[PDB]
Structure 1
Amino acid sequence: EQPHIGNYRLQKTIGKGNFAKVKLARHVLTGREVAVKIIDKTQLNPTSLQKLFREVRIMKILNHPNIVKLFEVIETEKTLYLVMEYASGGEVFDYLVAHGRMKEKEARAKFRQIVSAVQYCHQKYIVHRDLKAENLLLDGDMNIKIADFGFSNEFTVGNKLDEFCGSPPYAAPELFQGKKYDGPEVDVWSLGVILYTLVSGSLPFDGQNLKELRERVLRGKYRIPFYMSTDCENLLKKLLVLNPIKRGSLEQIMKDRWMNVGHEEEELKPYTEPDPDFNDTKRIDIMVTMGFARDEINDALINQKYDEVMATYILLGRKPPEFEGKPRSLRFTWSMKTTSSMDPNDMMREIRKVLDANNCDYEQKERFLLFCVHGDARQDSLVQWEMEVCSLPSLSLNGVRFKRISGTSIAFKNIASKIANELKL
């Protein structure tokens, strides 16, 4: 029986991977929603267990509105639990699944938040090294929420790193060569791969094998589409520079023309951390009435070890759940390809038939939600995802929400697109 861990009631899985799985949960004392990353302690070798100490250490010190925040760390002998901020809006590549290549003015809104977060990290001498699409999540307001610092580490001027941990398509060419790197320049490369992909719909480098992907990456030439602005193409000449010394630093990037069109007054400036507010008396007096002793509270916030007591206090300064006095009414990136007037239960009968024809297996979980799976794990093509029928802000219109649980974004986009093209609603 595992419905609970610590003070949390665990819910569905919202993320899965080779060595970690994430579940949505509700804190039982304060009602807030969280994501719980479940790391199995028995399958770690010397290197992965040094990454996990680096991961919890680094998340303890980042405090930025577009970086997933840590709430509590709970340990057992064989399992480690990181309780963190739940990003309920999906991932930034959902725009490309739903709508294809993004408009530069919309890509700029997210890329300003991504660069703000990533440069805030580089200002605290932290490099992410896994800035790939799967790690750019969105909250309920579609704000960027950068996640999974598992491959992350600190850097110091004068010292160099040698690990290669991130995804090959987003990896700077120094990594492909086994070359000792300085750090923050491999994220600046990797952000150029992200921006090229959001405004063009596909990755800048790709081959049908790693040797071809490596060769294309090292030559550093990508396709300039007809619809791409000079401004955007001049910025990628600052991100995708083959020589790491010649690549801009994100401080310069912030002052690039393309990142500030539409923002002439408010230019993108380095984010300055707020001041630590570990003495909010309203939240302390709420905790004492929930059964915590004032001294235990004060000590826990001075010791800063992300235990039960510190977790309740952080969670209290998050928006409470709304007071309580059939498809869901949700705000998601709907598309006219999947919007319809048809009765939702016949919408699911249609969704289930199309899944069968493209050899997708699924399991019904709620009245309007399926968990779907397609591909073969040998071909790096296995992908799992949710499909839910949700209402839109009108009278009888409903859509189909796709959310990836597992698998590559590339493979998710292929299978989700093909289902959406063939839904007849």
Structure 2
Amino acid sequence: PHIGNYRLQKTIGKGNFAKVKLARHVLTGREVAVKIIDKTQLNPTSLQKLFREVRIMKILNHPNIVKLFEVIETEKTLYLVMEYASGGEVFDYLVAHGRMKEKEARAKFRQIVSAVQYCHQKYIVHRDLKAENLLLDGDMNIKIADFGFSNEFTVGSPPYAAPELFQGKKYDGPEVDVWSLGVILYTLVSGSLPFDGQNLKELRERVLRGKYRIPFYMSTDCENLLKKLLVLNPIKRGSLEQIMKDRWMNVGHEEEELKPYTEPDPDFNDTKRIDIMVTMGFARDEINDALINQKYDEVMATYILLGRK
């Protein structure tokens, strides 16, 4: 069962209006994830919304955000061919494998913070970073998916969730992120959540008091970094750019200081990939238009896939 250049393999998620199939690209043999979406049943507002996500997926180009590779589209159906993070969610990972040494925890936090910062540079995020947004790929690299998206086209309140959200106030930016980001680190480095309890009333009591103990192996840099994230009043919280500069963030990176992400100049002329595509049947004009005009068609999708994994 194929769509376009993709052999569809197992289903990995159904949701109301979307189905994510794992798949293999028959030209290059890359594994990808294909989100199949019925568009026949969509009121105009769901359609407007569908197409906004698509625009955003189109511009997110980051080594730690899931890439979009191809859009194949009929009157009835939208297929979005996207990067596959084979490794699950980061919270599960920790629950399943325990804490990480600071060095691995940093590499992952670096990727996270940079991806979250970058999203903000690129669109306006209207909802909180969520556990289901933090994935790992086959090589333990972070990949953020759908940051700030509705879950219409997805497939009480969380332990990993700003204290002021337990006050009912809507998401207001890199401010709520910072708290979440603090819970991530706490767990990344300690294996356990910084706040918990039996039920809604223990969790909330705990979170809003915001006391936590650190484990004795956590380094002072790390504890210090945490003192900038897990902070009750949202205005006392470090900005993302300010977080990037923290000491713990840069241990081992004293030359390569963490910095807001800037997209490199895109390479549309990789001669290796082009030679392969010419051997495959594609024309050099075809490759180039596809690339410069970002069509997300069979051709552009091929050149991208030839560049990974």
Corresponding residue of 2:292:
302
Gaps of 5+ in 2: none
User: Does the C-alpha gap of structure 1 residues 58 and 299 become closer, same or farther in structure 2, counting only changes over 3 Å?
Assistant: same
State how far apart, in whole Å, the 2-side matches of 1:93 and 1:18 are: 24
Gaps of 5+ in 1: 158-165, 319-425
> Percent of aligned pairs with the same residue?
100
Say which SS state the counterpart of residue 80 (structure 2) adopts.
strand
User: Does the C-alpha gap of structure 1 residues 7 and 130 become closer, same or farther in structure 2, counting only changes over 3 Å?
Assistant: farther
Corresponding residue of 1:62:
60
Task: Indicate the structure (1 or 2) with the bigger Cα radius of gyration.
Answer: 1
CA displacement 1:302-344 (0-9 Å, x = unmatched):
33231222212222333xxxxxxxxxxxxxxxxxxxxxxxxxx
State how far apart, in whole Å, the 1-side matches of 2:212 and 2:274 are: 55
CA displacement 1:213-261 (0-9 Å, x = unmatched):
4444334333433443333222222112233322111111112122223
User: Does the C-alpha gap of structure 1 residues 167 and 55 become closer, same or farther in structure 2, counting only changes over 3 Å?
Assistant: farther
CA displacement 1:78-97 (0-9 Å, x = unmatched):
54322112223444345534
Shift of residue 12, structure 1, vs aligned partner: 1.9
- Which structure dedicates a bigger proportion of its chain to helix? 2
State how far apart, in whole Å, the 2-side matches of 1:150 and 1:78 are: 26
CA contact (8 A) 2:160 2:183 kept: yes
Bigger shift: residues 251-260 or 304-313: 304-313
State how far apart, in whole Å, the 2-side matches of 1:219 and 1:80 are: 46
Q: Higher relative contact order at CA 8 Å, sep ≥6: structure 1 or structure 2?
A: 2
State how far apart, in whole Å, the 1-side matches of 2:46 and 2:126 are: 15
The answer to whether residue 155 in structure 2 is matched with residue 168 in structure 1 is no
CA contact (8 A) 2:95 2:191 kept: no
CA contact (8 A) 1:185 1:247 kept: yes
Shift of residue 275, structure 1, vs aligned partner: 0.3
State how far apart, in whole Å, the 2-side matches of 1:26 and 1:227 are: 44
State how far apart, in whole Å, the 2-side matches of 1:272 and 1:153 are: 28
Bigger shift: residues 308-317 or 17-26: 17-26
Q: Where in structure 1 do 4 or more consecutive aligned residues deviate above 6 Å?
A: 152-157
CA displacement 1:354-395 (0-9 Å, x = unmatched):
xxxxxxxxxxxxxxxxxxxxxxxxxxxxxxxxxxxxxxxxxx
- Which structure dedicates a bigger proportion of its chain to strand? 1
Shift of residue 72, structure 1, vs aligned partner: 0.8
CA contact (8 A) 1:126 1:154 kept: no
Say which SS state the counterpart of residue 175 (structure 1) adopts.
helix
State how far apart, in whole Å, the 2-side matches of 1:233 and 1:6 are: 50
User: Does the C-alpha gap of structure 1 residues 23 and 245 become closer, same or farther in structure 2, counting only changes over 3 Å?
Assistant: same
CA contact (8 A) 2:69 2:83 kept: yes
CA contact (8 A) 1:54 1:153 kept: no
What value does the CA root-mean-square deviation take over the aligned residues? Answer: 4.2
State how far apart, in whole Å, the 1-side matches of 2:110 and 2:187 are: 15
Say which SS state the counterpart of residue 226 (structure 1) adopts.
coil
TM-score, normalised with respect to structure 1: 0.62
State how far apart, in whole Å, the 2-side matches of 1:238 and 1:48 are: 39
Residues 345-364 of structure 1 aligned to structure 2 (within 5 Å): none
